[PDB]
Amino acid sequence: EWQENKSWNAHFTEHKSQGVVVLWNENKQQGFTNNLKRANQAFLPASTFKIPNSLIALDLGVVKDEHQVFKWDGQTRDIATWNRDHNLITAMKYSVVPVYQEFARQIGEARMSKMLHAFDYGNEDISGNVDSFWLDGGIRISATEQISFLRKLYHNKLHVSERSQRIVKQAMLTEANGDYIIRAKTGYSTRIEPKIGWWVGWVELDDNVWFFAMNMDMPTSDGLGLRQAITKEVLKQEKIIP
Amino acid sequence: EWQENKSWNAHFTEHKSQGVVVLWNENKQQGFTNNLKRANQAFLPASTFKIPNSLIALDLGVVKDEHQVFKWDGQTRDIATWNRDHNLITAMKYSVVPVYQEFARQIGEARMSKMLHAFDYGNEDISGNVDSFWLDGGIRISATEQISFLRKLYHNKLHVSERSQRIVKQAMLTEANGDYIIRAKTGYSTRIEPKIGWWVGWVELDDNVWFFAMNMDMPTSDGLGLRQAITKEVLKQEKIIP
Ligand SMILES: CCCCOC(=O)[C@@H](NC(=O)c1c(-c2ccccc2)noc1C)[C@@H]1[NH2+][C@@H](C(=O)O)C(C)(C)S1
Ligand SMILES: Cc1onc(-c2ccccc2)c1C(=O)N[C@H](C(=O)O)[C@@H]1N[C@@H](C(=O)O)C(C)(C)S1
């Protein structure tokens, strides 16, 4: 079952914005969205690709553990937080593209292609530069295919080791308190039209898990905070979080 | 209820191919597929677009009835059956692209877009050339979206006349005997990757209707007969046909 709930369109209208939110209730095995068509439209994943990229780099030994230091290469880039030493935890937190480009070059085309076929990930197409196909190449994924992928990660059912899956879930930690835990990854696709923002992940409660995937039109970086704000307005209306 | 049935994958691996078959049982309102992900992935419709294009041409009076002759323009093309006079029945049987390109020019961009919105047909996007957008422009549709559309046609529920719907169902007639009737349309998309074959339609029994939509990888035109043969192997396994 998928069920359409157009009342969530209010949360987008409030900000003169357009997009989709998809929720999956793990206990009841039912899905909900404001737009069934856009829920199945495939886009470039941009920084959401850092979840499968991390899994592959750990399983092949390109990354030894979550404390290994990746030293700054000395090139001043326009994002201040990229101009420093990182590990896996900080490289995911600050979406540090140059660290992930170096992992992809060491994984290589052949192993990257075989791993994405085993994950059943989006359209499985890596055409383009081995170190930029998720930003300006031929790979495409829908919000519903993001949920399918994330459910397998949650249950340790991807073909890679239990250990690789546990470390990446630790790196995805975004928020936690007495009411909920959020594990998630942001993305911003800016190189090829149409320009879109992503937020994909899940909410852990005492007795259930809600998986989510949202995308929205992002003509400039001024609206990037709306990825989390709009998603949290839907979770409150559904009584998932206070 | 959607159920995944991976035993059907044997009919694709037998012929060294890959694809999806989707079935819908009208009496039970239940669907079956070998591949839930591919069942909801969007592709160019190619010649399966002759179903909506026929419906719109009839309803606007571009085509008067099933007997009206469309005289060959006297340009020699590749397919020998295209180099002769046609009516609606023979144009759909032989998939005569040049006849349908002239229908699209007389319908025009504004009326074509309005009718695809009224039908809820795929992504409803006609961007590209008015006479080739279903071959190489922006329009996309999934196997499950082809079923939704065909169910409305079967029940005379699309927003055109009853007369337009009855004449198109006549032009779709493919096979009939004492056990079953098949109404359907073939497609073959090669202008954009991946290259795919389509077969969409339904099977009329004495007391039920089974809707189907299949697509499969088609690297050369040598495998085109597999569109029908693999679909009939699934129908036989499920005891829908003898
Ligand atoms: C190795 C250098 C790679 C840069 O790779 C990009 O394509 C990045 N994009 C941009 O720097 C932007 C932005 C913009 C502006 C303000 C704040 C954020 C982004 N506007 O246009 C371009 C071009 C990175 N791509 C994103 C992603 O991978 O999701 C990002 C948020 C990490 S930012
Ligand atoms: C979480 C998170 O937690 N803290 C910050 C933060 C705090 C202060 C400064 C910068 C970031 C942060 C965040 O925003 N991280 C961003 C993110 O991945 O969503 C990335 N980094 C941005 C950038 O460095 O500007 C970017 C536009 C490259 S995408």
UniProtKB/Swiss-Prot annotation, chains A, B:
GO terms for molecular function: beta-lactamase activity; penicillin binding. Inhibited by avibactam, related diazabicyclooctane (DBO) derivatives and by bicyclic boronic acids, via a covalent binding to Ser-47. Inhibited by chloride, bromide and iodide ions. Not inhibited by the beta-lactamase-blocking agents, clavulanic acid or tazobactam. It is an enzyme of class 3 (hydrolase). The modification N6-carboxylysine is found at K50. Induction: Expressed from an upstream promoter, P(out), in an insertion sequence IS1999. Keywords: Antibiotic resistance, Hydrolase, Plasmid, Signal. Changing R183A: No significant effect on catalytic efficiency with respect to ampicillin, nitrocefin or imipenem. Very little reduction in dimerization at neutral pH. Predominantly monomer at neutral pH. Slightly decreases thermal stability. The active site is at S47. A beta-lactam binds at S47, K50, S95, R227. Pfam families: Transpeptidase (PF00905). Carboxylated on the epsilon-amino group of a lysine, with the resulting carbamate functional group serving as a general base. Probably N-carboxylated at Lys-50 at neutral pH in vivo and undergoes complete N-decarboxylation, at pH 4.1, in vitro. One of its GO terms (cellular component) is plasma membrane. One of its GO terms (biological process) is antibiotic catabolic process. Its EC number is 3.5.2.6. InterPro entries: Bact_Transpept/Beta-Lactamase (IPR050515), Beta-lactam/transpept-like (IPR012338), Beta-lactam_class-D_AS (IPR002137), PCN-bd_Tpept (IPR001460). It catalyses: a beta-lactam + H2O = a substituted beta-amino acid. Monomer. Dimer. When OXA-48 is present in clinical isolates of K.pneumoniae, increasing chloride concentration during antibiotic treatment reduces bacterial growth. Class D beta-lactamase which confers resistance to the beta-lactam antibiotics, including amoxicillin, and moderate resistance to cephalosporins and carbapenems such as cephalothin and imipenem; in the DH10B strain of E.coli. Acts via hydrolysis of the beta-lactam ring. Has oxacillin-, cephalothin- and imipenem-hydrolyzing activities. Belongs to the class-D beta-lactamase family. This is Beta-lactamase OXA-48. The gene is OXA-48.
